[PDB]
Subunit: 420 residues, 3 copies
Amino acid sequence: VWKDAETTLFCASDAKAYETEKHNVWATHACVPTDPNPQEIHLENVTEEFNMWKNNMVEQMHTDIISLWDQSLKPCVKLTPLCVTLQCTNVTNNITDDMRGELKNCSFNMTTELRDKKQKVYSLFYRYRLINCNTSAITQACPKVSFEPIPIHYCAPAGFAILKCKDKKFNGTGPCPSVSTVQCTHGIKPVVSTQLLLNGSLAEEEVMIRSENITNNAKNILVQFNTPVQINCTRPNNNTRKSIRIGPGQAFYATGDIIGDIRQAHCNVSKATWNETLGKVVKQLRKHFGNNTIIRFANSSGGDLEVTTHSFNCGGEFFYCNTSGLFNSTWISNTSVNDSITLPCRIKQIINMWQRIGQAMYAPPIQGVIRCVSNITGLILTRDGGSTNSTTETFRPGGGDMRDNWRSELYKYKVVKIEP
Amino acid sequence: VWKDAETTLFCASDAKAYETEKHNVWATHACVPTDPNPQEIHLENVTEEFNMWKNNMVEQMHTDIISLWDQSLKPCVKLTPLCVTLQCTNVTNNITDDMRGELKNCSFNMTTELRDKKQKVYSLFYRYRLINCNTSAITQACPKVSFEPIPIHYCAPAGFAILKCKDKKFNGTGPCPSVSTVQCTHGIKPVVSTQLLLNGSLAEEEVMIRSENITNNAKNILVQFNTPVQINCTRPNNNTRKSIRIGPGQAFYATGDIIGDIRQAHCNVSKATWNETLGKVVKQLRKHFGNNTIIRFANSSGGDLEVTTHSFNCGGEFFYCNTSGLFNSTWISNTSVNDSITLPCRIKQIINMWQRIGQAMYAPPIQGVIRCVSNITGLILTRDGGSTNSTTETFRPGGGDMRDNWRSELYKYKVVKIEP
Amino acid sequence: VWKDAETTLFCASDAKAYETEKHNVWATHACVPTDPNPQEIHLENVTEEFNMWKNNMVEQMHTDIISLWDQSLKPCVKLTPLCVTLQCTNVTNNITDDMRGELKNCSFNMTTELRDKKQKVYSLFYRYRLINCNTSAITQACPKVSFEPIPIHYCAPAGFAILKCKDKKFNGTGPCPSVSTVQCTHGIKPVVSTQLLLNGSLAEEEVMIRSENITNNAKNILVQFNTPVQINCTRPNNNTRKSIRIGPGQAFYATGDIIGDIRQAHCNVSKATWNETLGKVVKQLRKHFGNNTIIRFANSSGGDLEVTTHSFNCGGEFFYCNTSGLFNSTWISNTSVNDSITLPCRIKQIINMWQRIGQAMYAPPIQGVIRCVSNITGLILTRDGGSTNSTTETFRPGGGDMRDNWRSELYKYKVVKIEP
Ligand SMILES: *[C@@H]1O[C@H](CO)[C@@H](O[C@@H]2O[C@H](CO)[C@@H](O[C@@H]3O[C@H](CO[C@H]4O[C@H](CO)[C@@H](O)[C@H](O[C@H]5O[C@H](CO)[C@@H](O)[C@H](O)[C@@H]5O[C@H]5O[C@H](CO)[C@@H](O)[C@H](O)[C@@H]5O)[C@@H]4O)[C@@H](O)[C@H](O[C@H]4O[C@H](CO)[C@@H](O)[C@H](O)[C@@H]4O[C@H]4O[C@H](CO)[C@@H](O)[C@H](O)[C@@H]4O[C@H]4O[C@H](CO)[C@@H](O)[C@H](O)[C@@H]4O)[C@@H]3O)[C@H](O)[C@H]2NC(C)=O)[C@H](O)[C@H]1NC(C)=O
Ligand SMILES: *[C@@H]1O[C@H](CO)[C@@H](O[C@@H]2O[C@H](CO)[C@@H](O[C@@H]3O[C@H](CO[C@H]4O[C@H](CO[C@H]5O[C@H](CO)[C@@H](O)[C@H](O)[C@@H]5O)[C@@H](O)[C@H](O[C@H]5O[C@H](CO)[C@@H](O)[C@H](O)[C@@H]5O)[C@@H]4O)[C@@H](O)[C@H](O[C@H]4O[C@H](CO)[C@@H](O)[C@H](O)[C@@H]4O)[C@@H]3O)[C@H](O)[C@H]2NC(C)=O)[C@H](O)[C@H]1NC(C)=O
Ligand SMILES: *[C@@H]1O[C@H](CO)[C@@H](O[C@@H]2O[C@H](CO)[C@@H](O[C@@H]3O[C@H](CO[C@H]4O[C@H](CO[C@H]5O[C@H](CO)[C@@H](O)[C@H](O)[C@@H]5O)[C@@H](O)[C@H](O[C@H]5O[C@H](CO)[C@@H](O)[C@H](O)[C@@H]5O)[C@@H]4O)[C@@H](O)[C@H](O[C@H]4O[C@H](CO)[C@@H](O)[C@H](O)[C@@H]4O)[C@@H]3O)[C@H](O)[C@H]2NC(C)=O)[C@H](O)[C@H]1NC(C)=O
Ligand SMILES: *[C@@H]1O[C@H](CO)[C@@H](O[C@@H]2O[C@H](CO)[C@@H](O[C@@H]3O[C@H](CO[C@H]4O[C@H](CO[C@H]5O[C@H](CO)[C@@H](O)[C@H](O)[C@@H]5O)[C@@H](O)[C@H](O[C@H]5O[C@H](CO)[C@@H](O)[C@H](O)[C@@H]5O)[C@@H]4O)[C@@H](O)[C@H](O[C@H]4O[C@H](CO)[C@@H](O)[C@H](O)[C@@H]4O)[C@@H]3O)[C@H](O)[C@H]2NC(C)=O)[C@H](O)[C@H]1NC(C)=O
Ligand SMILES: *[C@@H]1O[C@H](CO)[C@@H](O[C@@H]2O[C@H](CO)[C@@H](O[C@@H]3O[C@H](CO[C@H]4O[C@H](CO[C@H]5O[C@H](CO)[C@@H](O)[C@H](O)[C@@H]5O)[C@@H](O)[C@H](O[C@H]5O[C@H](CO)[C@@H](O)[C@H](O)[C@@H]5O)[C@@H]4O)[C@@H](O)[C@H](O[C@H]4O[C@H](CO)[C@@H](O)[C@H](O)[C@@H]4O)[C@@H]3O)[C@H](O)[C@H]2NC(C)=O)[C@H](O)[C@H]1NC(C)=O
Ligand SMILES: *[C@@H]1O[C@H](CO)[C@@H](O[C@@H]2O[C@H](CO)[C@@H](O[C@@H]3O[C@H](CO[C@H]4O[C@H](CO[C@H]5O[C@H](CO)[C@@H](O)[C@H](O)[C@@H]5O)[C@@H](O)[C@H](O[C@H]5O[C@H](CO)[C@@H](O)[C@H](O)[C@@H]5O)[C@@H]4O)[C@@H](O)[C@H](O[C@H]4O[C@H](CO)[C@@H](O)[C@H](O)[C@@H]4O)[C@@H]3O)[C@H](O)[C@H]2NC(C)=O)[C@H](O)[C@H]1NC(C)=O
Ligand SMILES: *[C@@H]1O[C@H](CO)[C@@H](O)[C@H](O)[C@H]1NC(C)=O
Ligand SMILES: *[C@@H]1O[C@H](CO)[C@@H](O)[C@H](O)[C@H]1NC(C)=O
Ligand SMILES: *[C@@H]1O[C@H](CO)[C@@H](O)[C@H](O)[C@H]1NC(C)=O
Ligand SMILES: *[C@@H]1O[C@H](CO)[C@@H](O)[C@H](O)[C@H]1NC(C)=O
Ligand SMILES: *[C@@H]1O[C@H](CO)[C@@H](O)[C@H](O)[C@H]1NC(C)=O
Ligand SMILES: *[C@@H]1O[C@H](CO)[C@@H](O)[C@H](O)[C@H]1NC(C)=O
Ligand SMILES: *[C@@H]1O[C@H](CO)[C@@H](O)[C@H](O)[C@H]1NC(C)=O
Ligand SMILES: *[C@@H]1O[C@H](CO)[C@@H](O)[C@H](O)[C@H]1NC(C)=O
């Protein structure tokens, strides 16, 4: 007897990591070390039926990680008071292109100690007077933290197992020949991004495309790669940490010292991989739903900054990248058709977590010149509903609900229970 | 073996209701649906001894509901800051009877956004300058809530039962012939009122009077009816909801728009029922402790507004009703002796829950013209200690501890445990 | 089978005490009464091996009591706002010795009710204008509390026991002949002090010296006495309680009324006991590690006020005592060698609990003339690393981590588990 769908997930993690960093603090507090036994061991026959996209385990891991995020919001992060009005100026003494600025170094009036005293203080805002924040601001900061995803294992309890499709070619709703039962997963990393999977897991054989409804264009298409497309992101913006402890309740930072004239925040994607991978993707597409069609990739359709750009994190700052460089190639149905692609990005401090309960700020980006090298492990796509007179199919970057990213990770795990 | 008194109560509730309304939110969070099995099934003989007024289950349900009320106090309700001074005026441009006003439309100075800015704002106070609140003010309000009692079932756990006296005529301390054992109650509604039971449960046969000590006038007398006396309460006061979200931490309302000039807030009790019921009550009284006596009913003896009036709620506002109309009849011992009784009521926003930890405000009464039809299911009485030379007995409305209302509801449930 | 080290401790306590006092509130909330059975009963043979200083039970009781202290910090204690600047003066109108003052009666400006009104208010500071507090101030106060250690028993759960060395002469790392197993301890009192144990437990036979590493001078030496050295502490400082409730959120006190000109805060230690005890201690020392050496006792080496003085409490105020009177005797190796010792002490309101999360204030010391008689049950020592050419050994008062005080109390308890 195998019964499914039980919100019960054990956890596993730890080696050299402890506290400080918020991910490390979280894994430390919610996980125990693992054991290198796990045998799974598939048993002969025992079914061919499965459906990864109707897994409530995903929704569990999701709501869990979010609630944990609030549990991190509790102690140090400051929901108040200082955001009122900002006396900002610009570093531009001559100008072209009407740049203005995303980053501004500003002056302020700040409650320090005692009653109603102020001192002149530096403040930076990522996006002149006023302007403030809109109706909420939690400021994370904190003395000892950081933000790098840490491997988290999901295990089944006592009297429970987890079946796992080891079939390389799964239709997602469908015929699976090899079912095994593991007690605990290998350890999943919590990478929060859109459009591409960064870090994550690779396909064992060939590139695999997966959709909950290949006809319904509103449903996402998790495209998993057998190979990584490079992406090196260097944001050489510089900020010097100054945490002025002037008052008991108050804990204020001061960023925006020094110089260096860094261009925005910068990134690259490395293309050879992107050439073969995109060609092979249009190959898979044309060997699935797309039989004879020229495939075109336009950029994001529009929306919130988290939706229009590849919004991901390089350690707690929220990067937004113009994504035209990833999606600007028309793939000819007839046949297939040192330089690297350089993508324009921006660092944000003010992000909107949760629902609107509050905004989250990583206030003192420490040091400067911080490059994050990543492996493009993925694509999340939504199809642009087209016609058949166009003799072409258009595909756009979609996403937003990270639960889709977990289905893209939790695709081979379904918690099940055993009965005599 | 049957051992009693265990603070362990399972709960049951839900059908179409979900969240929003605070009662709905509570039942949703503290209850699971029920099953329409329950068989009770009385067993032949098995005792005649019981005592409803020494039940700690009542004290449990009570403390539970109150703690739950604080659990509702947590998220949205605002204990601070704005109550300081009020710049109020009156709508009276000509006058008789020196009415002044219970309700006032007032002007204020309000922290909106940023640092130390204000804007002119409407404010209403239910009860000229100043005056404020006394040393505490929690303001409930909230975007999605309401307040209507929701059926809550109390069940016994595993290895436990609940004996239930199905005897129609119980002396309260005494001889009960039919004991049954149910797993879960039919579902009790949390009606917070004094003097009368509103909604609640009716007596199966005749009117039943119940007292913990019929000699001790300090002990309450729960008079349960076999029939409901009508009470229709129309408060046609009008208030238009304006919730100005000016600042992140601040959430302010604005009531007191429009007009219609409604007299106070109004109510009615329907009398024919009240005639027969009161006659029958003096009948029961004269067939119990009152053998040969003329029975008179004077109004409340005095005290806090919650004690002098029939303080009940029509959806979160606290109504206070002049109760002379209910208790103004002298019942002659000799024999017995379309018009409806109309009662004067007032709506309050500022109530005192708990102990003095804080006052509770339902700040934006939404809409206007809100009529609540109710069934008078009850009387809670205290006797006026009289003499025997008066050749009369006087009875006054008492109450205050809602636990008495639960004994008036939890009268047929006593949690018990089973042993071999 | 006996396996050790399980963070599981049952608790026991209560007789006549209830709430109010914080210790009473704590024992009331975290303990159930006990039973006067406990039989322990040693069993013949069954080992000689033990090690009291590697007990994680101590660390458990410690972290528990501290977390409980924060749980007391929650409701009434005020982390804010009023500490800004103080307008203080002195009662000295003529002077010798440049005394200044530890205690000052001061004037202030205080938010009372409404918006931005103040009234002239008395304030006392234990340690002229300004000065305030440094970067945190929690103010305890509260309407109904106090602070006197209450006996707390530690018990082993189900399937667990606690072995107990009843050997009078234990080397601490070593050979123990009599092991017994109790379910619950006799009840340990939470005395927070340094250098001396006050209240606490006495040795059954002779004076016993105990060290984790008798060679390592950095390790503490818990010297347990078979007899108490007296210590009577009379602080006849007077303060009159005035709690002005001016505003809803605000709860302010007012101390520093009346007079009496009490000298600081005063104390005594009674010496005859101290004579024999110190002689016997140098006896034990010379019969252990000190074979032929003149033993000298200098005062505290320096540090925070909690480290330099015998920092203990007389009911919630933190006393600091000049400790030269305890350690000023050179003990001749050759042979041994009504007046009472009077020690100078100071009462503090501002103490630093925890880590630096915040300072704790007992704000209104109520009444005046409060004498606490105590039994000196102890010594915590650290050795001054000397030479062998000096032909003398010097010993200094050390301490600070109260866990050492619990090892000094939890010395005969090690929670263990049983297996077939
Ligand atoms: C608590 O207990 C107390 C008693 O202890 C109860 O107190 C009652 O409170 C209610 C609420 O206010 C009172 O109701 C109002 O009564 C007003 C006076 O009514 C008397 O006089 C009228 C003549 O105007 C008379 O018709 C009434 O008797 C009628 O009803 C009885 C049965 O009850 C019946 O036996 C009679 O035959 C009468 O029925 C005739 O008239 C009816 C209309 O009134 C017709 O429907 C029927 O077919 C027949 O022709 C009674 O003697 C009365 O004026 C008020 O009516 C107003 O306002 C109502 C809203 O509150 C609204 O619904 C009505 O339509 C009406 O509005 C119209 O008229 C007014 C002015 O009359 C205009 O301002 C409006 O603009 C509107 O105009 C329209 O109609 C005009 C005339 O036709 C026309 O010109 C115009 O063009 C428009 O078309 C209220 O009904 C009640 O009086 C109180 N009772 C007592 C004993 O004092 C209370 O019930 C109880 N509470 C509860 C919860 O139970
Ligand atoms: C801070 O202040 C500084 C000054 O202190 C200021 O400096 C400017 O910097 C910018 C960027 O380098 C310069 O912009 C470029 O100007 C080029 C030259 O334009 C002049 O000549 C044009 C014709 O030249 C063509 O043909 C001639 C043969 O005659 C040939 O030799 C040339 O090489 C070239 O082929 C002429 O059209 C132009 O005048 C136009 O505009 C003015 C108004 O500004 C108008 O009045 C005229 O009627 C006419 O429309 C001018 O005289 C220019 O070629 C170049 O344009 C190309 O590149 C841009 C992208 O960069 C394309 O958008 C465009 O389509 C062309 O492909 C570009 O515009 C500018 O010249 C400097 N200003 C001066 C005075 O030197 C900065 O703006 C300030 N900011 C900063 C941070 O530096
Ligand atoms: C953005 O802002 C960030 C800050 O938020 C800023 O960070 C800088 O990062 C760079 C690169 O890592 C640092 O540069 C290095 O600085 C080293 C330390 O220099 C300090 O101390 C010097 C002496 O130190 C010796 O002795 C001290 C004890 O006294 C001991 O602690 C040290 O370990 C060491 O033994 C001192 O001379 C120096 O001050 C010099 O310069 C200042 C002006 O800047 C001048 O006022 C002084 O008079 C003096 O000349 C400073 O106080 C330094 O050792 C090191 O130098 C070696 O390496 C470089 C190559 O990297 C060689 O060129 C050089 O010959 C040496 O071998 C190097 O210079 C810098 O310290 C950080 N700044 C801060 C504030 O921490 C980034 O620069 C900014 N980034 C951008 C993009 O703008
Ligand atoms: C806003 O301002 C307006 C004015 O702009 C003002 O209007 C008043 O409205 C009220 C309520 O309707 C009126 O009060 C009533 O007055 C009745 C008439 O009183 C006059 O006459 C009295 C004797 O009349 C009797 O006999 C005569 C024949 O002589 C006969 O026609 C009558 O029908 C009646 O039978 C007389 O006593 C009285 O004068 C008394 O008071 C004045 C001081 O005010 C004093 O100086 C006199 O010496 C004497 O004591 C007056 O001249 C009156 O009958 C009626 O009283 C009965 O009812 C009330 C309950 O309503 C009972 O309490 C009382 O016991 C009686 O049973 C009542 O008092 C008043 O007349 C209006 N004023 C004017 C100027 O017209 C309002 O006050 C303001 N407020 C609002 C919102 O409207
Ligand atoms: C408030 O104001 C009042 C005034 O209104 C003021 O009162 C002072 O109170 C203090 C404490 O009681 C007094 O201090 C003592 O003074 C003693 C006397 O000193 C005088 O005489 C000294 C010599 O006397 C010796 O020899 C004579 C014979 O000649 C013999 O009879 C005496 O008994 C004694 O043996 C003399 O040296 C001294 O003058 C010295 O100092 C002044 C400066 O002040 C300097 O100019 C001189 O050159 C010289 O150095 C003075 O004339 C004194 O004996 C005593 O000292 C002993 O005790 C202290 C400890 O208390 C030791 O530290 C010291 O080593 C000695 O053992 C002590 O100093 C003082 O006299 C009062 N002042 C007056 C004017 O009467 C307070 O200060 C104010 N405060 C309060 C709260 O009261
Ligand atoms: C430090 O400050 C604290 C305050 O925080 C202060 O505390 C005082 O503690 C002392 C000692 O315990 C108290 O002294 C006692 O006060 C008793 C009460 O006196 C009050 O009431 C008197 C009458 O009371 C009778 O009737 C009332 C009802 O009316 C009833 O409640 C009582 O129980 C009792 O039956 C009243 O006369 C008295 O006022 C007198 O004095 C004031 C000036 O102080 C004057 O203005 C009045 O006109 C009047 O003369 C006061 O209001 C009192 O009964 C008691 O007296 C008996 O015992 C003493 C010996 O102890 C005998 O000498 C005396 O003859 C009586 O037998 C005693 O005096 C005092 O009340 C506390 N103060 C406060 C504010 O509570 C300390 O003094 C300060 N300590 C230091 C070191 O400075
Ligand atoms: C998928 O979507 C299409 C419409 O886009 C619909 O026709 C089809 O029935 C859907 N499949 C499922 C399983 O709902
Ligand atoms: C970034 O570095 C990796 C190797 O670490 C390389 O494969 C990749 O091509 C680089 N990215 C670009 C755009 O050059
Ligand atoms: C990047 O994308 C935006 C829309 O998201 C588009 O308008 C813009 O032209 C693109 N930028 C580049 C460099 O192509
Ligand atoms: C607001 O304005 C009123 C006068 O309209 C004044 O009495 C009051 O002091 C003002 N309050 C503030 C916040 O200054
Ligand atoms: C009931 O109250 C009366 C006094 O009012 C008293 O005489 C009687 O003993 C009481 N009964 C009980 C059970 O206490
Ligand atoms: C209503 O009751 C109050 C006392 O609570 C009494 O003073 C008043 O006279 C009564 N009012 C009416 C309308 O009878
Ligand atoms: C309170 O008054 C003092 C002078 O008595 C002054 O120095 C101080 O600034 C005042 N504080 C406030 C709140 O203005
Ligand atoms: C005790 O400390 C001394 C150094 O002071 C060292 O020589 C000895 O090895 C230590 N013993 C243990 C058990 O570490």
